[PDB]
Amino acid sequence: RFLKVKNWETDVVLTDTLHLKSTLETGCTEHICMGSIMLPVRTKDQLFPLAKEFLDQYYSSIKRFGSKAHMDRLEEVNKEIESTSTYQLKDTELIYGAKHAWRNASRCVGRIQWSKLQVFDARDCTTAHGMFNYICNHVKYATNKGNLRSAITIFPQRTDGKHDFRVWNSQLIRYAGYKQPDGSTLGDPANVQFTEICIQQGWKAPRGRFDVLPLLLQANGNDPELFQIPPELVLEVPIRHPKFDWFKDLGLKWYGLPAVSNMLLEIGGLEFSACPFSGWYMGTEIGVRDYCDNSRYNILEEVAKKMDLDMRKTSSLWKDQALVEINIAVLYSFQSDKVTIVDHHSATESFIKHMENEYRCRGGCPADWVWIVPPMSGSITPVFHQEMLNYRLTPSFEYQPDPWNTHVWKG
Amino acid sequence: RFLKVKNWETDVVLTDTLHLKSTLETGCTEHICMGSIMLPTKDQLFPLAKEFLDQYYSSIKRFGSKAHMDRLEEVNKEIESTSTYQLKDTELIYGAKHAWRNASRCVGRIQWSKLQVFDARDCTTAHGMFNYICNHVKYATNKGNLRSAITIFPQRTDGKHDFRVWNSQLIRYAGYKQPDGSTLGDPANVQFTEICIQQGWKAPRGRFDVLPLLLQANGNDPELFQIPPELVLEVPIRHPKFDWFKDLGLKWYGLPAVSNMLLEIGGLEFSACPFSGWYMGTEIGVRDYCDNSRYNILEEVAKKMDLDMRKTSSLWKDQALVEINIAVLYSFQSDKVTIVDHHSATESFIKHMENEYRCRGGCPADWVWIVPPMSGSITPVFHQEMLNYRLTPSFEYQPDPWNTHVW
Ligand code: HEM
Ligand code: HEM
Ligand SMILES: N=C(Nc1cccc(CNCCc2cccc(F)c2)c1)c1cccs1
Ligand SMILES: N=C(Nc1cccc(CNCCc2cccc(F)c2)c1)c1cccs1
Ligand SMILES: C[C@H](O)[C@H](O)[C@H]1CNc2nc(N)[nH]c(=O)c2N1
Numbered sequence: 072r073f074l075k076v077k078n079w080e081t082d083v084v085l086t087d088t089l090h091l092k093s094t095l096e097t098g099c100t101e102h103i104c105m106g107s108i109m110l111p112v113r114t115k116d117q118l119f120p121l122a123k124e125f126l127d128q129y130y131s132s133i134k135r136f137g138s139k140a141h142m143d144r145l146e147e148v149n150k151e152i153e154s155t156s157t158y159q160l161k162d163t164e165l166i167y168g169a170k171h172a173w174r175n176a177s178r179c180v181g182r183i184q185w186s187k188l189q190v191f192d193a194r195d196c197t198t199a200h201g202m203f204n205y206i207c208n209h210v211k212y213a214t215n216k217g218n219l220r221s222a223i224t225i226f227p228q229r230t231d232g233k234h235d236f237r238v239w240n241s242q243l244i245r246y247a248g249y250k251q252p253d254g255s256t257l258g259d260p261a262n263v264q265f266t267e268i269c270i271q272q273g274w275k276a277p278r279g280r281f282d283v284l285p286l287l288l289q290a291n292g293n294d295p296e297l298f299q300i301p302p303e304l305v306l307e308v309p310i311r312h313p314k315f316d317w318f319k320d321l322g323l324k325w326y327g328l329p330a331v332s333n334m335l336l337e338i339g340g341l342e343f344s345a346c347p348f349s350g351w352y353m354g355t356e357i358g359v360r361d362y363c364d365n366s367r368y369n370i371l372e373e374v375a376k377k378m379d380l381d382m383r384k385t386s387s388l389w390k391d392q393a394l395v396e397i398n399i400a401v402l403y404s405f406q407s408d409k410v411t412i413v414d415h416h417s418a419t420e421s422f423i424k425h426m427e428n429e430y431r432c433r434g435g436c437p438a439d440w441v442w443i444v445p446p447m448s449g450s451i452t453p454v455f456h457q458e459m460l461n462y463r464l465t466p467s468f469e470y471q472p473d474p475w476n477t478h479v480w481k482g
Numbered sequence: 483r484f485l486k487v488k489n490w491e492t493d494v495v496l497t498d499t500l501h502l503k504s505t506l507e508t509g510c511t512e513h514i515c516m517g518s519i520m521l522p523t524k525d526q527l528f529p530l531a532k533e534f535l536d537q538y539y540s541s542i543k544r545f546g547s548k549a550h551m552d553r554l555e556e557v558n559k560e561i562e563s564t565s566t567y568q569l570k571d572t573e574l575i576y577g578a579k580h581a582w583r584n585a586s587r588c589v590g591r592i593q594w595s596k597l598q599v600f601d602a603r604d605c606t607t608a609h610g611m612f613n614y615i616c617n618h619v620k621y622a623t624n625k626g627n628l629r630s631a632i633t634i635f636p637q638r639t640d641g642k643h644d645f646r647v648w649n650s651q652l653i654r655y656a657g658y659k660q661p662d663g664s665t666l667g668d669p670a671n672v673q674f675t676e677i678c679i680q681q682g683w684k685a686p687r688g689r690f691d692v693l694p695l696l697l698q699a700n701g702n703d704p705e706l707f708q709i710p711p712e713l714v715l716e717v718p719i720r721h722p723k724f725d726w727f728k729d730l731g732l733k734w735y736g737l738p739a740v741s742n743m744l745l746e747i748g749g750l751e752f753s754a755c756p757f758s759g760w761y762m763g764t765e766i767g768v769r770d771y772c773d774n775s776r777y778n779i780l781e782e783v784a785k786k787m788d789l790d791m792r793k794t795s796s797l798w799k800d801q802a803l804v805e806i807n808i809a810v811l812y813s814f815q816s817d818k819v820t821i822v823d824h825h826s827a828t829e830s831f832i833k834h835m836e837n838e839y840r841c842r843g844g845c846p847a848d849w850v851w852i853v854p855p856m857s858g859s860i861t862p863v864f865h866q867e868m869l870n871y872r873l874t875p876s877f878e879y880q881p882d883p884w885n886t887h888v889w
């Protein structure tokens with residue numbers, strides 16, 4: 072079967088066949104669309120078809136499908152599964168699987184970059200101190216003094232589910248949040264619960280507005296351990312505005328390296344529960360979401376005050392006005408400090424070219440419109456006008472529950 | 483089977499049961515979400531009529547009463563014999579309000595119970611349609627203090643005698659493809675403009691020519707009518723800070739009135755059912771003015787603001803976008819023509835979703851359409867999970883009549 076998507080700005084029509092390869096399910100049915108819902112231990116039985124399907128995809132991409140190397144590899148994996156109940160990926164297959172999980176990430180606007188990903192193989196890691204060292208190395212390589220390079224570090228896969236590797240942090244670099252007795256929050260409200268867990272575990276909290284959290288690392292299903300990233304490895308940008316000289320006095324800064332550490336990477340039925348990955352920011356992530364969500368740093372009022380906008384009525388668009396100035400400031404600052412960042416115009420235009428290329432060479436590009444459209448100026452970006460099809464391909468990044476909700480404490 | 487929607491800003495979780503009542507399909511499957519796609523006989527009729535009458539009688543606390551059973555029998559009788567049926571005035575009104583209530587893409591539904599229903603089922607000719615429409619325009623405009631209204635023309639019979647308004651909105655501007663190769667006026671309406679011309683309209687060929695009405699009664703050939711200028715309230719667009727803004731020569735009309743949809747009630751189909759409310763400001767300032775395939779004025783505005791248009795990362799488009807939208811709201815407000823800003827409208831909609839969950843068990847909502855086209859995440863709907871599903875009575879899309887009509 073074929074499916075068409077149309078761009079309503081350009082009338083360009085594209086044809087999807089890739090959706091035929093989708094296996095995992097969406098949450099939607101013929102009677103209900105779940106497209107705006109935020110959230111979407113294996114047998115030998117289920118494992119061999121997953122491995123075969125993956126290895127067939129890998130062998131086709133290297134133009135060796137049905138070769139002797141292909142056939143021998145299938146047999147080698149089959150034997151390993153029934154003998155040891157699982158299997159190990161070769162290095163090339165791991166690299167391919169990690170890149171493809173990114174290529175297949177339908178909520179990712181940055182996928183034009185998918186084939187340029189540095190893969191660090193950390194499957195020989197055994198302790199949390201080992202994990203600390205791997206993570207430091209990742210951050211230093213990815214940071215590259217501001218010329219950010221995409222990277223992923225892949226700790227040992229799941230075995231019985233009782234020996235998981237996990238990074239408890241939601242991002243490798245992120246700011247603490249502290250709920251005060253009077254009910255206000257100091258620092259980042261998104262991270263209060265995790266900050267509380269760190270303190271409980273022994274972290275000496277500085278209790279300021281931008282304290283970089285310590286790493287909380289779990290190796291081999293053991294209790295997690297606390298480490299501090301060396302400050303010299305944490306690149307940060309003070310935020311200032313090109314015209315508004317009072318902007319600096321808001322005391323804002325943000326870190327340069329976005330590094331997601333709480334997702335699960337699934338490759339050929341194997342589950343990599345610790346797989347921190349990093350790229351670079353699109354400006355709106357910081358200027359719109361981190362700074363301006365009511366439940367995050369919530370700076371809109373203070374900024375509009377300093378801009379002396381008319382705040383008596385929403386219809387003066389004071390929020391919209393302040394929003395734009397803050398976002399200009401974020402891009403200005405990163406650019407001035409030579410730290411990689413992309414604006415939402417550049418990013419969405421690049422995504423449309425990526426998507427079209429993918430339709431032509433791959434037969435499709437699964438994409439989640441709700442997530443691809445930026446959180447400001449939606450319709451003056453080309454993605455707003457682009458119909459998209461959302462489906463799930465493997466290899467993939469998947470959500471997993473926060474580990475404090477599942478961990479069996481050893482004590 | 484019982485479904486939860488979470489607001490990620492406030493943590494409020496609501497439980498949806500209303501979706502189990504859904505009849506029509508979504509376009510989605512368990513393998514593919516089509517959430518962002520723009521357009522996804524007598525035997526068929528009695529179940530649809532029964533389902534409708536059941537909800538109607540339930541709504542007036544008379545479910546399973548003799549009045550209920552009697553009407554079911556009566557309509558049954560009437561379909562058996564006539565192959566269709568007629569709604570009582572009360573049922574028609576209820577059904578129209580509920581088609582609005584059920585419109586998953588409509589952010590303004592807090593208003594749904596306040597809809598003036600004009601029954602034009604006695605209408606027979608295009609001149610008659612013109613008269614009803616003028617009366618609707620004048621009633622709804624109410625000198626700037628806009629009132630929601632729908633005018634309902636006769637229902638489909640054998641489908642060869644359709645009433646249709648060929649216009650996509652009652653009031654809209656013409657578009658003219660030019661020797662130049664550029665488009666003068668509104669590029670969305672080029673095709674319709676030409677049809678009007680080719681039917682004999684004498685076009686002024688300006689930037690903001692109010693289209694004539696192209697009205698089709700009883701499956702006959704459509705006829706042209708000019709809406710009395712005095713009934714078309716228009717707003718000149720100026721900015722409260724930029725004195726130069728007025729020199730752009732921008733205006734818009736006060737009355738948004740959709741005329742190309744099909745109203746489905748209890749299986750009956752009302753193919754001409756023009757309906758009107760009032761604007762959310764972004765519709766004009768973001769979409770009408772700034773879409774690339776529309777008036778596309780971002781470049782000229784940015785220029786008058788002397789912004790650095792060298793780099794996308796200066797956010798010159800974004801800055802100009804906000805100013806254009808400030809001007810739209812200020813101009814409508816200054817002239818006392820009802821308008822709602824996107825902050826106000828989306829705040830209302832969250833309150834309405836909460837009412838509907840509390841009083842009806844749910845509220846179908848299409849997040850892709852509900853979130854405004856600017857400043858998405860600073861409005862509360864951005865953070866609100868929504869379930870989309872199709873309830874009847876409903877408004878439905880239908881093919882443009884010129885593709886279908888046999889002249
Ligand atoms: C190279 C620069 C990149 C940019 C600018 C970028 C941009 C983004 C942004 C803006 C989002 C949405 C984030 C949010 O609102 O929470 C996102 C989602 C995502 N991207 Fe990227 N991306 C990049 C690289 C990467 C890399 C290197 C990977 C993994 C190898 C990745 C995988 C993802 C995934 C899995 C999501 C979805 C997260 C979820 O569902 O919660 N991206 N991308
Ligand atoms: C009273 C003020 C109202 C406001 C502010 C309002 C707001 C809106 C907006 C902004 C849209 C999106 C339109 C677009 O982007 O093209 C919309 C969609 C819609 N509204 Fe309303 N609405 C109002 C009243 C009404 C009324 C009176 C009806 C019907 C009786 C109605 C039925 C619809 C329908 C059916 C759609 C979806 C059209 C489609 O799917 O293409 N609304 N509403
Ligand atoms: N630019 C980036 N941003 C990014 C990419 C993927 C994921 C994320 C973080 N997503 C947060 C999702 C989330 C979590 C908790 C609550 C919530 F509302 C939303 C951020 C990158 C991070 C890593 C590589 S690129
Ligand atoms: N404020 C209004 N706006 C509005 C409400 C419903 C529908 C519309 C017009 N929608 C046009 C959607 C559309 C269709 C086909 C192609 C396209 F690009 C865009 C506008 C109202 C119109 C009537 C009552 S409220
Ligand atoms: C409820 C809704 O799905 C939720 O707010 C989504 C909307 N779109 C998003 N898009 C991105 N990129 N990131 C997000 O966190 C969200 N949040």
Ligand SMILES: C[C@H](O)[C@H](O)[C@H]1CNc2nc(N)[nH]c(=O)c2N1
Nearest residue numbers: 455456457458518519520850851
């Ligand atoms: C392709 C995409 O579905 C399309 O551009 C939609 C997105 N959301 C929208 N939302 C509204 N309210 N109106 C629209 O016309 C659209 N267009």
Ligand SMILES: OC[C@@H](O)[C@@H](O)[C@H](O)[C@H](O)CO
Nearest residue numbers: 241261262263264265333473
């Ligand atoms: O404070 C705890 C949160 O940071 C955490 O629960 C995240 O929201 C979660 O890891 C998803 O990002």
Ligand SMILES: OC[C@@H](O)[C@@H](O)[C@H](O)[C@H](O)CO
Nearest residue numbers: 261329356357360361364367
């Ligand atoms: O916490 C809700 C959002 O504000 C948050 O997830 C941001 O979008 C994220 O930090 C962007 O990178």
Ligand SMILES: OC[C@@H](O)[C@@H](O)[C@H](O)[C@H](O)CO
Nearest residue numbers: 670738765766769770773776
């Ligand atoms: O033509 C595509 C859109 O610009 C258009 O449908 C507007 O969104 C509409 O006129 C707003 O009322």
Ligand SMILES: [Zn+2]
Nearest residue numbers: 099104510515
């Ligand atoms: Zn769906």
